[PDB]
Amino acid sequence: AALTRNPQFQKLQQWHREHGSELNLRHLFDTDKERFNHFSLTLNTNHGHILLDYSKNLVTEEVMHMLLDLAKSRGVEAARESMFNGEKINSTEDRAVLHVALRNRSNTPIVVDGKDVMPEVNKVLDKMKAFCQRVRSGDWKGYTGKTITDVINIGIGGSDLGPLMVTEALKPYSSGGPRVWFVSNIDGTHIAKTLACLNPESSLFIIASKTFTTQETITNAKTAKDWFLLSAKDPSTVAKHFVALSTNTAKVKEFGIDPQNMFEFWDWVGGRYSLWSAIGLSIALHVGFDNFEQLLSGAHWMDQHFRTTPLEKNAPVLLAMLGIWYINCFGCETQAVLPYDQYLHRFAAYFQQGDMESNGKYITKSGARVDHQTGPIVWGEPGTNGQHAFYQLIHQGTKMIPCDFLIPVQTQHPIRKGLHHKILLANFLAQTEALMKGKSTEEARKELQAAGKSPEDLMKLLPHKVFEGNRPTNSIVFTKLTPFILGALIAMYEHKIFVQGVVWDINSFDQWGVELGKQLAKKIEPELDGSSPVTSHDSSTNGLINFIKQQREAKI
Template sequence: ILNTLEALNPETTLFIVASKSFTTQDTMVNAESAREWLLRRIDDDDDLHRHMVAVTANTEAAIAFGIHPDNIFRMWDWVGGRYSLWSSIGLPIVISIGPTNFTRLLQGAYEADCHFREAPLEQNIPVLMGLLGIWYNNFFGAQSIAILPYDQNMHRFPAYLQQADMESNGKSCDREGHPVSYETGPVLFGEIGIASQHAFYQLLHQGTKLVPADMLVPASNYRCIARHHRALMANVFAQAEALMRGRTEEEAIEEMRAEGLDEERIRTLLPYRVFPGNRPTNTFLFHTLDPKTLGSLIALYEHKIFVQGVIWNINSFDQWGVELGKKLASRILVELNEGLPVASHDSSTNGLINTYLEMR
């Protein structure tokens, strides 16, 4: 937060503290630092309410923090954080892109909602996405999925979906509390497509792991030089084809002979120039990336997550897996603030904490 605060003018700065519970440690530590920064720079402490608003389901905690009741945007307590951008949590988005564009974002999501509710199963995009994912995960042993947007403006989309998917379906107990006997949510990762080609496509094409991939690409991009975009599209189609078809020994031999290689060199290189193929991809081709399209894409993935949760009989809307770390962090923070050697944890954790205390 220090890098952000350095460039701000307190007289023209509004902080939005967005926290459903208003108790999340990392959020509140930043909020407290922002409040202290303001109090050191504004003339009247009573003016604090002009510079801080909250989005939360815990209005009492927000008021206790110092947020004026009129500056609290309430959210429903049943909305999960990873599904909340459509609610008042989206206030920063409204401020950033304007209400018209935010309405378009909502419209795109609404249309995806209607499609999911009304389309027959065999034409229902989230249902098909969910079933394909389960087919690869539970029947072919795929343990991960790659999200590959071919548009720089979507460079954070894989990270967004990481929370949406893995926090929702990374579960080992079913809805009745029984351990599951099958695989559930996969590891989701991704990066901009062109960057990915130079990073991990080698593993996608010739590795020992089966990694299904989703490629997302706009057919047109007014922010891109036309010939650059054509080159980008060529890569999208080429990678999808290569992952699907691969390259046989016969094709590799023919290609190397066309390159003028001798037979001994061909025999040496042949194992490395064969591609097994049959690596699954979905390609999402849309007209252009705009708020409406983005809203539809996000909602389609949300519904896919729900579909898979239903089939796996797990609760996609809780996240008990994050609770233990939070509780331990609160306890350890007290110990770090005290600054005394600790012996109350396991030997590894004790050693890490005590080494940190010596090094700081």
Template structure:
């Protein structure tokens, strides 16, 4: 990839001038000027997903200038570099090939002079065979009983992705109960132990290195609990599987080498649900549905790789985000899925985006003078309308939003779904147009008639608040896969444009390192008195010592 400061490009300077022209233009005016604006500013993906970006503060000129920026920083070359396995994760000297995990077309992907696809298919086949044994009851626990519960032990990408997908695809779920343990807070596993049976539970330890503190702390505590019931360590092999690159540590834990699923260093954690990290997904919805999830993502990959920039959905979505973040200086964006099953999607995309592009050092090793990753947040359905939408409509913060909804629901309560979708349609309309035109007309009448207009002031909605509308025909494994891949590629595009390394996460490591040092200090402290840190940290730790003595 080229290491180009985006603010020094001709396109960036052109966008700055264009912003002065358009910053006060109202969405109402844009729709009045173009009666076919929806048609002209929307895309359809495989007759399954509609991406409507017409309610954004952009014109043809805006989009063209944004795409000129993409071309000037050689975005198309960067996309090709990722797909052919170049080591674009420079700070870790790794390729970025989560796209290989869903490459169902059997096209070779060469890494270090070797086609990696046979290995990928081998792991997929292993997931298929293992899952069939577990789902059908052929796999037995130490007492001869079939498995009824699955516990996924992981954190970050090893938790958020699979957890989100399983919830989103609840209508496809089988009889197995899937549980997730991620937090190092002991409360989580204490509550878990209340609802599982050691004889019928299978534990998946998902850790690339098999050293992640939260994951391994939970894994060892669960192992100790399990052995209180199963007694013999030989039974660990019937109840624990590992998803890791560190085979030696997994075997030392007691896991049978045959029960270790391969994982590659070219798969980033937050992009790993497509890999063996997604084995809990396979166990929940079956291998056939997991393949459909991969298929949807693969088709979006092909769209992203082969579609011209002006029709490329992830590219357009990404460039609009850069437009708001760097020119309107809107530092946050919200994700609103109008479907209860997808309630974890905002959290998943929050991690995927903020861990990827939350960087302030560019690819040249210099501090950025431009905005990089946005703050991502959100909630599902109409609950948010009764919580924070007030600020969205009338507050001083302008927050671009993505509204996501299925046209066809999995439930049969039609009255509920039409009301849900009516809210979906209404919110994007209200944010865009508010009462702008009606208010101006009422004010004119009132002024002419010399009537006090205060009562209307508080009901004034300025509108002009942008949003994307993403309609899925139905939430299926295929459409969910396409949707998630679309957002992955959006994040990648923004990293390319903003000249940052998207696929490392060094910011995650500092807190872990300091935490480890503090824990050792606390454990070795003889007099319950810490003085080696700043006054705040010392004071908090010493207060912990004092209060702990009372219990």
């Protein structure tokens, strides 16, 4: 594998196995009061500021220089240009990777197969804008002349999570927009519970699917249409209640959706990087097209930052290299994402997909099997809730867990004259301070003695109240969570994921395991029908299938 054979990686590795064990955050701050200044980055987007404070990390100037030298020797910049220039860096599927083109507000030409893709990107965007206009203004009428009150997005994975997370994060900006619903799981409960609340006369279904063949989505789509026609009664009416977001005109046709009602994207648009495309139709319908264009602009701003800033001051690069540091040097399996914002309740989940589906690989672009760690397990929940739950393990467990704490300075709901947000911010700050500082044995025993504890009680309870600290965190603070800032934040992490993938020399844009999954259920599905036992698989699969058929009858 490329990484292990790299001299910069070896130098960093040797340094860590020579000093790593010795790096204490509390000590570092106590010996360098310019630390914050030296390990923090402030970005002024002219539409809000974003402060990336990475000073609470187990690093020194020597460590950062070695990490950036690695980014350089691993060719991050050249790879970055290849992506922005439309080169087919997705080597296994031989495709370009152009989500940056989707939000290329500057309209600078990007050539693929001898053709600028921007004209087509803008054509779809204009079509989306015209459609949303019609729907929102009430011009688009259902089969009975009523305006559309509900929009239902049917899709899964990359055709679901992005729009779900963004519409949730941007709720404050959806005034004058129809209600938006997201159905994704094949589990019947999802679509059934959704349909139960809808009126077919005023509901518009959006079938999101790059391929338009995914089993969960097509099956949900058919159930929706069947449900609809139970009222409509004229397939000529579905044209007024069903539209498609896809790249496969053929399939959309077979389903019963004529063009003009198909908003397309392209193969260089990865599913987990597709919310910026026609896939974001539900977003635009929810918050309006101006806000949707703001989202795109925020992403474009971050793309430009990533492309023009020297590595040492490049946000996504710094985030990516600190991650490489914890993953490949400290051996940390996970990465926690902790937004202190309820609207971002699906943010961690979104990047759980974005990061893991991209870098959960073990084969390099040269075909060699990696002999080092790659993508981490990403998780988290919106604080503060976590503090009263899993934070216990982050503070006093046996695992090192790098955490990204995020929060907006200004809230969308300054109720009680800002009291709630004041408390939220204080907790945000105090948590990373405590993770860094911890609480020594002397400090703990002091409190216990002041509490008047007997020598007996203090002795047995003292160890349990000590916090070793030295747990690294990043604090990302932005002025306000607007469509623009959100877009820049999502783009920031997309590029962090990109940089790590380049350093590991893997292809962060294919998903063979996901592709495989879409073809596994195939064989067992028909075998579940009969009531006769199955014996064609290993004994576990057989036993589970037979327990299934047996309990199918059970009358509980």
